[PDB]
């Protein structure tokens, strides 16, 4: 399960894999403190996504993160369906699909995040992150702790805070980290995270006393030519995680 | 059978409770079938016993069963979600955060699921924090009505159950809910404190706003406490008000 | 001889305003606050002026008449009811909508009380919305006016403070500071209301005292009410009093 | 004995001052009853003396007395007089309207609300009490927002003062249009004389203000006796009939 993937129980990386070969190199470079993203959108049917994800899982101790694909809400229903057949270790989901996904897991255990977004209003998140809700003229903009309580009632384990646009919403992010710490809830900062702002983003969460943090680092560490997530980048991220977690 | 068969001229269906299966049959007759009959999960100690009972009701009333929490009791949300794996009924009462689980659990079966959202004292806004953990929070998620509608659609729900209304204590709020539902093409289920003296007003507000589909819930106000039965004459009276109003506005 | 409400301000600067579930809760609150509180009793909770008057007198008998007469639920239809209650019972403090202040002061007659005036944030620093009566609040446009012009009108109508609502906690912080500074310059009192909780209370009181407002009445309602018992939490009142003392003890 | 009897064809009532009871009787006759006669609170040292006087005037002219300020320092005096004598018509400053209404109790009367030209078409100055008029800035508000406030305070009309004759004509016409649209009465005052009276009343009538009370003070008063000139009242009534007969 996912609890094995947190360095000292505090931080697990989430990065994408180009293919199974890349997944294996990533898992090794992270010393196992990682869940590896496999994207539902890369496969034409639920059936094919399941078979692929089981194949990844076999090589990396089922440390698979089931992905939408950069938070793409068109894939929410697909991910909910996949959960009937494959739990992975970690599941990315939009806010309104968390309940369906948890129900679909049935007797299987997994960890499900809930995508909520910056609003420009410190203290408040946008929970309207499914297909119909994201197409609304207005969004449901709610205090962070009220979103956490709803995610709990729906069977989720964390907030996926996306799109962060790196540090563009840093003040808002600090408030989300504080609320998560106060409620004993996990946090997954995502969007525009790179080797340069990674330390800051993870430190903010640990300094706030968020117990479990899963930073997501996607295209910024992907080699454009080969498409592979770079093993040296994964090393560098892990080095940061250790430096920070050892102190906090 | 699809709940759509239960709406008079496609516009209004009653939701009332039944005390036993005979009472349910009498109600279904009195309403000319334009009703779903509430059977409460909280009246059964196991999901299995609730399922067995609900199927027995459904056999006698063309499956026009409304699966109840029990006065919106949020502790029954998980029970109702589990019942949906085994019995879809025609109509399911659920709290906002449990709609998605309930829809998923229906599996290959179809049914109609409402979503409990509450008055806030703030015209234009509803409280969606109606599950066990969310309702215990110090603050609630108070959102514009249409944003709640959109979320309910993404979770697989069919309507807003607007509760507790306290009759017309929140009339201005309720008017705004009806306007939003009409604009969004979404159904509305007014509930709480509805009786023979405010039923017409409450249904009229929704129809005048051009809400397409309305399901008013009328519970204890029409129950004879001596027998425990929902009063058949009350159901006939409510049906007559429905036909008058639907004929006027449809 | 001191006015009743002057007795309710800690060192003359801050009086709490909280609701009570019943008389015993009111008594408990008044003790927890060391009397530096007025307790809200809402007119909307009574179906006649006479019943409200009886009830409010009964609260007053137990808490040195430290009753704050309320509208209830923000329902501006209660403004006329509050104005009529004032003919019979002054309490210590009266909540009123801007256009109903004058009738309320007139109806007090020979009786003494402190009357606030509801004005609202506008999204425009320096300006408040005074269109808070039944007809005016339903208008196509609102009377949006500089803060001091609202203060001077409230004074001509017989009121004592601005009730600044709805604050949404610290959402209108910049607008609120401008209201506080204008109140300070005019020697007028301020009653911040809406979304105040144990976490933002200190900042809300500090913004006002730092700007040199002399008398502040923060209203703390749902955030300190136990939803299960309906009581305003006595331990929350004790905590808020401790904050008030810590601030006020260094603000002169 | 209410003010509705004082409007010629239900449209226009004069308001002019009386210097003594004989002058009041003469004015009431000259206007054929289509007048409220002003008695100034400031002409008496106490409320009680004003009340005794105003009652004596009213006895002679069918209660057709307009209670006058004469001056915002008299606002509180007028509010107090209203406890004891309603007249038919009461002049009041904007912030004292609700006190005055409340003081009337069960007695009926018509209360105006003094609001002022601003130099900004569409906007009136409602800061017309003693403290408000002494402010550095004034509350300058859209006309219809003033009307709604006056209604919430229990007033019946806007007293638009000081007009300075036609110096604020564009503004006045906009006030008339707004009053007509809202079904509210209007009382033009300040510098009205025999030369601009027709123009001022025509503006209100073409705007379709239902009830208009033009106030004509010093321009028709004999300085040597203090009396309002009875022939001037007849001249004004002739203009009122000539105009109003075209609209009613
Ligand atoms: Ca099958
Ligand atoms: Ca038709
Ligand atoms: Ca000072
Ligand atoms: Ca000092
Ligand atoms: Cl981003
Ligand atoms: Cl229910
Ligand atoms: Cl109810
Ligand atoms: Cl100052
Ligand atoms: Cl608020
Ligand atoms: Cl003039």
PDB file of N, CA and C and ligand atoms in Angstrom, chain B residues 68-72 93 161 219, ligand 6:
ATOM      1  N   UNK B  68     -35.609   5.799   1.811  1.00  0.00           N
ATOM      2  CA  UNK B  68     -35.413   6.908   2.739  1.00  0.00           C
ATOM      3  C   UNK B  68     -34.225   6.743   3.653  1.00  0.00           C
ATOM      4  N   UNK B  69     -33.634   7.876   4.011  1.00  0.00           N
ATOM      5  CA  UNK B  69     -32.687   7.946   5.089  1.00  0.00           C
ATOM      6  C   UNK B  69     -33.453   7.865   6.390  1.00  0.00           C
ATOM      7  N   UNK B  70     -34.457   8.725   6.521  1.00  0.00           N
ATOM      8  CA  UNK B  70     -35.260   8.876   7.735  1.00  0.00           C
ATOM      9  C   UNK B  70     -35.128  10.321   8.182  1.00  0.00           C
ATOM     10  N   UNK B  71     -36.021  11.182   7.691  1.00  0.00           N
ATOM     11  CA  UNK B  71     -35.959  12.601   8.032  1.00  0.00           C
ATOM     12  C   UNK B  71     -34.581  13.203   7.727  1.00  0.00           C
ATOM     13  N   UNK B  72     -33.961  12.775   6.621  1.00  0.00           N
ATOM     14  CA  UNK B  72     -32.657  13.314   6.180  1.00  0.00           C
ATOM     15  C   UNK B  72     -31.467  12.909   7.062  1.00  0.00           C
ATOM     16  N   UNK B  93     -33.495   8.880  -1.670  1.00  0.00           N
ATOM     17  CA  UNK B  93     -33.063  10.044  -0.891  1.00  0.00           C
ATOM     18  C   UNK B  93     -31.636   9.887  -0.462  1.00  0.00           C
ATOM     19  N   UNK B 161     -32.927  17.969  -3.112  1.00  0.00           N
ATOM     20  CA  UNK B 161     -33.881  17.865  -2.004  1.00  0.00           C
ATOM     21  C   UNK B 161     -33.582  19.017  -1.067  1.00  0.00           C
ATOM     22  N   UNK B 219     -44.817  14.429   4.872  1.00  0.00           N
ATOM     23  CA  UNK B 219     -44.574  13.308   5.784  1.00  0.00           C
ATOM     24  C   UNK B 219     -45.548  13.362   6.969  1.00  0.00           C
TER      25      UNK B 219
HETATM   26 CL1  LIG E   6     -34.968  10.801   3.810  1.00  0.00          CL
END
